Amino acid sequence: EVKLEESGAELVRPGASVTLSCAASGYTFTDFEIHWVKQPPVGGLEWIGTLDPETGGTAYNQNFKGRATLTADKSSSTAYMELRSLTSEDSAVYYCTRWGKKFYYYGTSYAMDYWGQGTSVTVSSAKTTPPSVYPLAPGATNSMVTLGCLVKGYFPEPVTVTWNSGSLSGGVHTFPAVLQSDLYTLSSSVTVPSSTWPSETVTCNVAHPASSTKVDKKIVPRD
Amino acid sequence: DIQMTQSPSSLSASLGGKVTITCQSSQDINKYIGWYQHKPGKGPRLLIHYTSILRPDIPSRFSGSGSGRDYSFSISNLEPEDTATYYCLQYDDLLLTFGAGTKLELKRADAAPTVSIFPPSSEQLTSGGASVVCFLNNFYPKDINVKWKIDGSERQNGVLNSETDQDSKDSTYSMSSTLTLTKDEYERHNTYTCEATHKTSTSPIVKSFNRA
Numbered sequence: 001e002v003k004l005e006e007s008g009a010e011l012v013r014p015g016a017s018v019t020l021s022c023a024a025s026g027y028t029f030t031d032f033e034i035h036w037v038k039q040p041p042v043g044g045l046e047w048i049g050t051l052d053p054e055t056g057g058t059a060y061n062q063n064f065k066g067r068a069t070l071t072a073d074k075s076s077s078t079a080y081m082e083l084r085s086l087t088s089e090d091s092a093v094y095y096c097t098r099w100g101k102k103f104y105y106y107g108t109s110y111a112m113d114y115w116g117q118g119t120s121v122t123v124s125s126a127k128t129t130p131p132s133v134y135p136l137a138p139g140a141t142n143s144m145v146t147l148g149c150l151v152k153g154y155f156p157e158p159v160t161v162t163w164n165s166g167s168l169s170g171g172v173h174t175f176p177a178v179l180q181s182d183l184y185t186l187s188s189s190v191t192v193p194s195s196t197w198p199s200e201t202v203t204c205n206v207a208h209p210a211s212s213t214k215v216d217k218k219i220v221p222r223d
Numbered sequence: 224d225i226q227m228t229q230s231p232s233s234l235s236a237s238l239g240g241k242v243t244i245t246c247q248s249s250q251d252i253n254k255y256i257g258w259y260q261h262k263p264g265k266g267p268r269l270l271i272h273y274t275s276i277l278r279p280d281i282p283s284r285f286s287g288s289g290s291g292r293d294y295s296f297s298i299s300n301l302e303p304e305d306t307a308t309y310y311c312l313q314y315d316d317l318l319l320t321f322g323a324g325t326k327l328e329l330k331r332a333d334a335a336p337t338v339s340i341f342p343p344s345s346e347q348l349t350s351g352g353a354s355v356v357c358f359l360n361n362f363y364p365k366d367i368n369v370k371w372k373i374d375g376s377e378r379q380n381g382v383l384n385s386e387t388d389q390d391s392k393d394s395t396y397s398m399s400s401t402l403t404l405t406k407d408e409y410e411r412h413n414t415y416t417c418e419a420t421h422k423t424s425t426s427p428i429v430k431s432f433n434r435a
């Protein structure tokens with residue numbers, strides 16, 4: 001029931017701006033402040049600011065005054081954060097989260113009890129590029145075998161990887177993407193019983209929403 | 224503005240064991256501190272508010288204490304699902320502040336990497352490229368070094384390495400390493416070797432294949 005639903009990933013050119021949205025449902029919108037929080041690539045959570053959607057009242061950490069602007073639309077139950085005139089220092093994941101507005105002697109119970117799923121913002125002049133997806137199949141036999149997918153040459157993050165559409169979830173390692181010369185590469189491994197492959201079907205499912213790309217790649221033994 | 228000093232920055236402890244993290248505020252925060260958990264690849268979660276008050280869906284292993292400027296957070300009877308980064312937050316002001324975070328890892332027995340090497344697919348080759356991939360999976364401890372050899376000779380350029388966060392079931396780490404060449408250059412050589420040094424073996428752990 002209580003939900004905070006954020007907008008999708010944004011690619012922004014240096015010097016340009018973008019506006020993020022967070023749609024609340026499952027509670028009375030105007031009884032809670034909306035706080036925003038930054039999660040930089042390396043290093044820890046930073047509090048950006050608070051908005052009281054009933055009145056338009058705001059407050060910001062100093063470092064974000066001049067950079068972020070918080071508003072809301074009560075009709076749609078939706079909070080917004082405009083991030084203006086960006087650099088790579090502003091590349092990060094941004095969350096909305098709620099805070100109980102009403103004063104109590106021992107403070108609120110609703111202290112960032114629910115969070116949005118995060119919106120990833122990448123500030124760069126590189127171009128959106130779809131991944132190529134290549135199967136990883138062995139070139140020696142044991143009771144377990146390890147297969148893979150190489151997801152190479154894409155921009156920007158993120159991509160989604162699953163195996164047999166969700167069914168193979170055990171023994172999966174999906175490795176963090178590495179950036180080289182404006183293109184990301186990632187890999188994912190799955191381990192299954194050697195009795196089960198290649199006698200049965202194992203497929204990696206890769207999505208890159210920025211490029212509208214969905215691929216299924218069947219892992220077949222090596223020629 | 225209230226500053227928060229969270230210590231330590233990193234903690235390593237054994238299964239079943241106990242850890243404590245501290246936070247110190249630049250002025251009295253009157254017990255308005257909360258503690259949050261950030262597990263890898265997920266969003267933050269509230270554990271405790273007003274110094275010691277637990278959510279009811281959080282294990283009783285988690286607790287908190289303190290007053291004035293000095294606070295602590297503790298986990299008893301550590302489980303591998305506790306692996307995460309932890310943050311304090313002060314909210315005794317209009318402007319809130321997070322501490323810098325504490326990354327918690329668990330100790331366990333030494334485990335050798337299970338190593339798999341994969342040649343370039345026909346799909347990649349036909350487009351002109353050739354990547355060779357090595358997975359070094361479910362090892363402990365985290366420190367490992369990987370080198371690529373082509374017909375015996377070391378190649379450092381064109382190598383992309385990626386490490387997982389600690390696994391939240393078996394407390395191991397995994398690593399992927401990808402050597403990217405051209406088709407042209409791949410087809411000039413025969414032997415491709417993934418060579419790993421790890422404390423579990425005196426000499427390297429290797430996997431190779433021959434193109435023909």
Ligand SMILES: [Cl-]
Pocket residue numbers: 045046047319320321
């Ligand atoms: Cl902060």
